[PDB]
Design a protein around this ligand. Structure first.
Ligand SMILES: [Cl-]
Ligand SMILES: [Cs+]
Lengths: 394, 256
């Protein structure tokens, strides 16, 4: 059947139309052999080092923790080429596509960051790239659409359904069912049918590997907790993976709380959704009582995925990792604080992680604790959104 | 009840193939849908394949995506579909009725509970579009426990191990998507699979005749019927007359 386990406990699987199963089996086999292939590993490491900018810095915050016993470090995936952690895994997947003899790339995108990342990896490696985007998201992210077009990607708007990310996830699958002979489906997060939750984790796991070596170098000990926001789960599982067996290290994922869990307008499926089956996996998701799939809501477009990676649902169930939520307002405050005190503009996505670290520090200011936040991207893309909200308030 | 065995037994003594229209339940309204289905049967459909509107039908093309949107606009819910299924079955005791489902609607209130409810309203078979045979065990076990036939799609890219799983696991009929066609039918009857219905791009009477002559027990028109509904949304009476003319023409073609 498969070479690797498609399930994490009870979550995961390969819930796709029969016609896509050979494509997933081909992909899993190519991934397993790429992972045992020193030549592939060296090409991948070469691209990450000399093209994307790895290793990224681990910055000790100077000012933000003043008057507490917290020491806060930031893993600076905002300094990665493209400005977000997504770049790591699209380079790996593009090298995989070439290894399989594929020449075309399919990708879905909502906020546009995965579409930009897939377009730049495709231009670098000589792959023709077509990108599906919900027409609601096309209208609202015309900067990112221009970027993709500058990089030679074909952008295709989706009006099906609610014309957002989830409906882009569907039309990419339809395309790939016909075109997988020559096309690779470059999924954007650590979710979907096996083997994608495993692949995206392994192509993001250097975040945690570097963090561990960097924190041991600087502080001589492992952190008390590493904290990362969770839209689909790729940046969080990439930070977590190398600490999973270090059972003294807290693992904290932060889901978007939106206007508040109690309002119903949030994007926290792991803690406040319900297990269902969609997008090729059994996982917690945003759904109605009838079993229809809703959208997440968050101020940060990048946490818009209405489900969550199945390895996260597994880690939660066994108690290895804890998951919390942070509202729009808490994230906005963290955005402003990092700007004013450290001179770093964080992505509104990453600001949810930082906001929870600030909560831990402020609620117990005499607790000694060593925290690492995964700063998954930079916030230049969010300054217009933040500006308008702050004008509308005063 | 074994409606499929009875259907095929009579069809074979009359050397006919089966003609099976697909239609989305509640498209474009609940009452108009109920009249569309009564027209399809009366014009000669041998069985029915019915979709329950789902938010994210990732295995469907645009014609069915729009059919779901029309039904959602009409307020159709899974519960209202089951109410409709009980009515249809009350009017038409012998026609086989198959459901095309997505896994989340089957999983939502419990897999076993879903198949119990199908048995209650008299549904004969269930195809779950996004459950491959490799993941099917809890679905087909629940189906068999409630006397429901689990339907599996045999795709064009099928290898031999898939044919053996499809032949052992399926009941009622095999859903054929378009390796030479004639060879697929022969391997399937070699492995004693449920009778194969060809279901890829069946649009004209000539395609129905080709499928039967090629060894398939019949044909499913998977979207040509929904196109007729889409074409004629403004004129309900022209909609039913076009549906009547098309279905009787397609069903005449199955008489080889
Ligand atoms: Cl560097
Ligand atoms: Cs989420």
């Amino acid at each position: 059947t498969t070479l690797l386990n498609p399930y994490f406990g009870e979550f995961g699987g390969m819930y796709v139309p029969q016609i896509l199963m050979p494509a997933l089996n081909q992909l899993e086999e190519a991934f397993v052999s790429a992972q045992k292939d020193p030549e592939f590993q060296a090409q991948f490491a070469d691209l990450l080092k000399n093209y994307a900018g790895r290793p990224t810095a681990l910055t000790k915050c100077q000012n933000i923790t003043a008057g507490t016993r917290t020491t806060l470090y930031l893993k600076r995936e905002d300094l990665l080429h493209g400005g977000a952690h997504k770049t790591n895994q699209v380079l790996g997947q593009a090298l995989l596509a070439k290894r399989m003899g594929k020449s075309e790339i399919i990708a879905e995108t909502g906020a546009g960051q995965h579409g930009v990342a897939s377009a730049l990896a495709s231009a670098l490696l000589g792959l023709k790239c077509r990108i599906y985007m919900g027409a609601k998201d096309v209208e609202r992210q015309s900067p990112n659409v221009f970027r993709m077009r500058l990089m030679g990607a074909e952008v295709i708007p989706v009006h099906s359904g609610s014309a957002t990310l989830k409906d882009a996830c569907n039309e990419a699958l339809r395309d790939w069912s016909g075109s997988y002979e020559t096309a690779h489906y470059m999924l954007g997060t650590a979710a979907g049918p096996h083997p994608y939750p495993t692949i995206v984790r392994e192509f993001q796991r250097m975040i945690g590997e570097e963090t561990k070596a960097q924190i041991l170098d600087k502080e001589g000990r492992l952190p008390d907790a590493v904290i990362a926001c969770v839209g689909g789960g790729s940046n969080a599982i990439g930070m977590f993976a190398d600490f999973i067996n270090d059972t003294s290290v807290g693992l904290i994922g932060v889901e978007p709380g939106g206007h508040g869990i109690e309002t119903g307008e949030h994007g926290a499926p792991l803690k406040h959704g319900r297990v269902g089956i969609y997008f090729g996996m059994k996982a917690p998701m945003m759904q109605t009582a009838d079993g229809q799939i809703e959208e997440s809501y968050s101020i940060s477009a990048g946490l818009d995925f209405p489900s969550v990676g199945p390895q996260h649902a597994y880690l939660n169930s066994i108690g290895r990792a804890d998951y919390v939520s942070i509202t729009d307002d808490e994230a906005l405050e963290a955005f402003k604080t990092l700007c004013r005190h450290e001179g770093i503009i964080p992505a509104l996505e990453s600001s949810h992680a930082l906001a929870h670290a600030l909560k831990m520090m402020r609620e117990q200011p005499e607790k000694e604790q060593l925290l690492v936040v995964n700063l998954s991207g930079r916030g230049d893309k969010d300054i217009f959104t933040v500006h308008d909200i702050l004008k509308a308030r005063g | 009840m074994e409606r499929y065995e009875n259907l095929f037994a009579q069809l074979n003594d009359r050397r006919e193939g089966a003609f099976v229209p697909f239609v989305t339940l509640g498209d474009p309204g609940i009452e108009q849908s109920l009249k569309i289905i009564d027209t399809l049967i009366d014009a000669g459909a041998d069985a029915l394949e019915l979709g329950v509107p789902f938010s994210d039908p990732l295995a469907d093309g645009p014609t069915i995506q729009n059919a779901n949107l029309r039904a959602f606009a009409a307020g159709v819910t899974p519960a209202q579909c089951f109410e409709m299924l009980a009515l249809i079955r009350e009017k038409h005791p012998t026609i086989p009725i198959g459901l095309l489902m997505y896994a989340n609607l089957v999983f939502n209130n419990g897999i076993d509970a879903f198949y119990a409810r199908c048995e209650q309203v008299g549904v004969d078979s269930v195809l779950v579009a996004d459950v491959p045979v490799e993941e099917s065990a809890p679905f087909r076990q629940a189906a068999l426990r409630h006397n429901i036939a689990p339907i599996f799609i045999c795709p064009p890219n099928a290898d031999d191990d898939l044919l053996r799983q499809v032949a052992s696991y399926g009941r009622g009929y095999t859903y054929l998507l378009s390796l030479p066609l004639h060879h697929l039918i022969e391997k399937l009857k070699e492995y004693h699979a449920a009778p194969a219905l060809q279901g890829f791009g069946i649009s004209s009477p000539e395609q129905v005749s080709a499928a039967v002559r090629a060894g398939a027990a019949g044909a499913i028109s998977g979207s040509a019927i929904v196109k007729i509904i889409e074409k004629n949304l403004a004129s309900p009476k022209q909609m039913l007359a076009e549906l009547r003319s098309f279905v009787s023409a397609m069903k005449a073609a199955s008489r080889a």
